[model samples]
Target: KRTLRRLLQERELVEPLTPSGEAPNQALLRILKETEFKKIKVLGGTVYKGLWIPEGEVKIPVAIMELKANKEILDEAYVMASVDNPHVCRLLGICLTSTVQLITQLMPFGCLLDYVREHKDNIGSQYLLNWCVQIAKGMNYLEDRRLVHRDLAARNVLVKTPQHVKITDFGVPIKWMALESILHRIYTHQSDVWSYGVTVWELMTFGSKPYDGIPASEISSILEKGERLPQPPICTIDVYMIMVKCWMIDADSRPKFRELIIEFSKMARDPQRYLVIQGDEDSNFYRALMDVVDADEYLI
Candidate 1:
């Protein structure tokens, strides 16, 4: 009752931005119970879904991120609001009632983590390339905007359609974290670039666990020893090389998201040259084929 009362007491003080239009001096309303709003789905992190009904506008479906009242939802809102790229998840608004709920646009195809596991074999290389291209494009956008995603992984990437993907979870797990993030909680655009490499590996391997055999405690030591995740069995050599570029130990050595976008764009334009083979590791064939790609000064 305390929470509800406080929420109800807040008078219309400022204009609120909505997906449709701004509601100037719109009085804040009390948050309805879960039963009051339709439940679309339940995801990890105890996140539920609902629709935010704006006055005189179509109901907008949103992912209601469950966070505690004690935590800071405004920080998330500020971060998300800053980036408006199609490849990034859009934050609609927030409900500051009993508990904090971050409202974001609903992704129709769900997150890439589970999507790839079920549809990897069925999804064609062209579709996979499109997903990768979108991720690269999104990361490039983030980089250009001076924002570091901090967490870039298959799990964080949401799929709207086979052709469209967006980065999410501005959160992180140790597996997808860069060495610096793991060791010191230091995040930069370059750290995100490292995680992007892992994401590409996840895409190529149909969602195989990163650092499969290595334990969490040993990852840093192994990484320091110059050991990186092995190339996926079916991944093309050119794609693997790109992944290697991302895994460079020196943060400065990693390719920028823009560079990765350009490389993926080249693959997108010439699908025949970057063909995906099933369990094929003909390095010589790929090396020779890619030499022709290298000869193109425009792509170079």
Candidate 2:
């Protein structure tokens, strides 16, 4: 379903048609060719182009594109773009260059499973607090840019290093698209806040699923009732409280992403200082809880 405007431009617009294709905007594609496209690198869920610039330091993550609108596109883009040029992706607005790369392109976290299993009990979960803080910072950046992610969850976020996790995939960000451009209509900054809360839960809980047992339509109802998933694994009471504020049933009640950053930073910096409880009460809760706890740590 190519629209007439797109056809008249005489441009070959290869918008992503599936979950796995690179975004096909021409300018991004041209700049993308200058860099190598490694098959394996950890990144946000969105497909991307990456470059290992000898001309520059670290291997840069670039964006080719998204299959559909998503939170990570705007959510991650705002954060990455906010950083100084060398530290962030180049934003042409139409597409991002060196914005994100796949995780498998680097060494395997899979190989480290044994190490994680061996040290499971010994490793301090408190160490993950730093990662949580980074995510919070990313969300805060998005809010500052007035871009709402509208969808923030663990599967959508990607880990670039042990010390850092960058927000990726903004396929569902708000305020960028015209009302007539998308289906199911527009999303708000509040929607992004809900997503950010979920992301915080993911980091604190070792990556739990946001809403597992109910049909998608029920999500609003369940959340509307003030229900929330159990706090993340090893998460403390303060962390749970922050999540509570984030997952508030009323979108208006959900704290702004910047405010969330403030709250989470306190907990992340002192998890032991904050006593928290797990929230699983039923099979559905347990299912969502354990699924994330026991599965692979990183999502591809």
Candidate 3:
């Protein structure tokens, strides 16, 4: 539904923001050259951290994902705008041209991968569990909208603040992909569930690399044999069990994001059920202990 102001503007004023279907040149007219900008990184193309200031509005901090005009810059903007959830990054606008740039909300703390690696010692299992729940809630929001996040991972989720996080980087990567997506070029919400499970593993292990020794070619075969990622040292059995459900070989067998949200909520309510055991009962403890025992290279 169009806002009352939008309806009035449609009848009266010239539209400043470019609509999806119009020509790229038309969109180009709306974007002035950005003076306040700094390079962030280059993935497929260069990305920059910048500000978007409209004529009577305050300056809005944003990330400009720059790519060639031929790419689906406008399409991506539309998909992002369609989902209005706090856990997903907001799309401010797009500057469509030879150097197309998508403007999105800036996440100051960077990605979850880097955040956990730097702060794991300071934070605890409960904090990580809360983040896991937050991500699951975000996925549930997307699932309800019938949108599949083709890519979901620690690296894709951003820390908006120490207590909050949001999912980003919708582009798919072959390594993070589900078996069905790899084989058929098809992606469903279930594929996202598989990726979410891998993401859980990353959180539990404080952002360790996924499938460390397994080559990409052998991943499907290993998964075919029901080989999932090893349980992380910090993860409780119950948490690992939920992750296992996400890695079901059959897509239909995997639980929906709603189910996961409920499961994580229950765990959150009674935190003790999934607390990291400090004694021999803790499986992760023994693995780390054995590794140290053999090498005498413990971090003492």
Candidate 4:
């Protein structure tokens, strides 16, 4: 109803941020001078990290990526450009001409998935929770604006320091989507809240793929049968409680990003209070234990 209109506005805002003319011009919010920006490296097939004019001024560090030329991607560029949050990746501008390149902030440390797993042994739990707080704050901004991240997951997030991370990507991967979204192909801010909990699952597992052994087709029935990712070893019961709220099957039952920020910080600050793990007989101490073991090539 109202939420559908709100989501449609996500597309409506694009024209304001993009050029109206058929050809590239100065109308777009800030156009990327396609020829002026230099290509630094080919980050896989679709993305390129580079700067404007290479040495012009200081250097506008950015990634020029060609997302699928769908109306939604262009709509997403506008959404990306519209946000002003430290935790959200900045959408510098776009060259909607050529192939419609998105000029965005270049996250040096790369995605949270690889970053946490690589540092699995060195990183501690509190630091991971702190990043979760940052992500919550970033997501709060989107929530307030009523923007749907559509793609919220650890692999989609970029890490700067152990404490610093930013939300990016705008896909609708089945693994990261809510049940309603998967079944009806509907997405909303609440759907994002659902993904936020899954993002926590990734961090708690230090980036183990969620539902690692489960097949995509099997996920819906499993969730329908009241299944979710098991509590990973690194998260405290407190932290897991927060994930539980976000994963509520009733989308609106999930807490708002604002609520998440406060709750996450409550534990993040009083680390001494929430850090203890009350061990039980079934403790999968061996689970994340195996996580540490599955680290690198040569075992030390």
lDDT of 2 by residue, 1-300 (tens): 769897767555555445657554332221233334332332344644332222422343333443344455555445433432111123433333444422212211211222233334443545455655666677676666565655555544544434545554444332112121123455677656656666655555443444655565455455445566776656666667776676555557767756766765776566656634333211221222121221112211
What is the alpha-carbon RMSD of candidate 3 to the true structure? 12.2
Residue 109, candidate 4: C-alpha displacement in angstroms? 1.2
Candidate 3 or 1, higher lDDT? 3
Query: How well does candidate 2 score on lDDT at residue 288?
Result: 22
Supply candidate 2's per-residue lDDT for 232: 62
Task: State the local distance difference test value for candidate 2.
Answer: 0.45
lDDT for each candidate structure: 0.69, 0.45, 0.70, 0.71
TM-score of 2: 0.54
lDDT of 4 by residue, 188-287 (tens): 8888899999998888777788887688888888888888888777666877888888878899888988888888788877664655433311012112
Candidate 1: residue 258 Cα off by (Å): 0.9
The Cα error of candidate 3 at residue 12, in Å, is 23
TM-score-better candidate, 1 vs 2: 1
**Model 1, 1-300: lDDT tens per residue?**
559566556635434544756544332223434433344557653686555444432344456787643546767666665566778876655666566666666554567877878776676667677778889889889888788878788978876566777887463477777788888889999998899999988988888999876678878788877888887765678888988888888899999877888888888786645756553221221222121211011111
Provide TM-scores for the models: 0.74, 0.54, 0.74, 0.74
- To one decimal, what is the Cα RMSD in angstroms of model 1 from the true structure? 13.4
Q: Clash number for every model?
A: 0, 33, 0, 0
Q: Give the true-structure RMSD of model 4.
A: 12.6
